[PDB]
């Protein structure tokens, strides 16, 4: 592997480790990965971090009833750009009616960007991904990894 490939795989492993921990504990989480469409306007709504990715930091960010847990983490250029960011709520009538604002925010950003957003449900610990205006629900660990590698 090249340095850039090794770095991408390390980031994927850090994300999946954090997501698994949160899914097991039913910790709600919202993590958007910026792609070609710039998301600076949304990054600017949160708390700046520009931090190295680690599973530890991702977990610490989303702990319930803490300063950083409300809102989205946005990743950009292999770093955590900001936490507690605003994302736009989707008005799509085709999202499962049992899902709340975390999932609607993820679908919303996916409607206007090419980003990939991961959501952990605080109700069930279920893991989902929003891309292109669609929500892919009840993902296995393998499925999430496949989506991150495809992305």
User: Closer CB to a second copy, residue 45 or residue 60?
Assistant: 60
Stretch that binds Mg ion, among 11-19, 44-52, 70-78, 136-144 (CB under 5 A): 136-144
Three-state DSSP class for residue 113 = coil
Give the residues lining the site for ligand SYV (CB under 6 A): 25, 27, 63-66
Residue 25 binds which of ligand SYV, Mg ion, a second copy, none (CB < 5-8 A, kind-dependent): ligand SYV
C-beta of 123 vs 138, nearer to Mg ion: 138
Within a 10 A sphere around the Cβ of 148, how many other Cβ atoms? 20
Residues 23-52 that bind a second copy (CB under 8 A): 47-52
Closest CA to 107 of 98, 140, 96: 96
- Which of the 8 DSSP states describes residue 88? P
Provide the CB-side half-sphere exposure for 144 (13 A, CA): 24
């Amino acid at each position: 592997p090249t340095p850039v490939e090794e770095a991408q795989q390390k980031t994927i492993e850090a994300i999946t480790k954090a997501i698994n921990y949160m899914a097991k504990r039913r910790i709600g989480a919202l993590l958007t990965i910026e792609r070609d469409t710039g998301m600076g306007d949304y990054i600017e709504t949160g708390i700046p971090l520009n931090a190295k990715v680690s599973s530890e930091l991702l977990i610490n960010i989303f702990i319930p009833n803490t300063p950083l847990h409300d809102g989205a983490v946005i990743m950009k250029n292999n770093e955590i750009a900001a936490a507690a960011c605003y994302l736009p709520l989707s008005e799509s009538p085709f999202i499962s009616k049992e899902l709340g604002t975390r999932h609607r925010a993820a679908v919303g950003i996916s409607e206007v960007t090419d980003s990939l957003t991961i959501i952990v449900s605080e109700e069930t610990g279920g893991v989902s991904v929003a891309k292109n205006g669609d929500l892919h629900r009840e993902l296995t660990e393998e499925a999430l990894k496949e989506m991150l590698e495809a992305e």
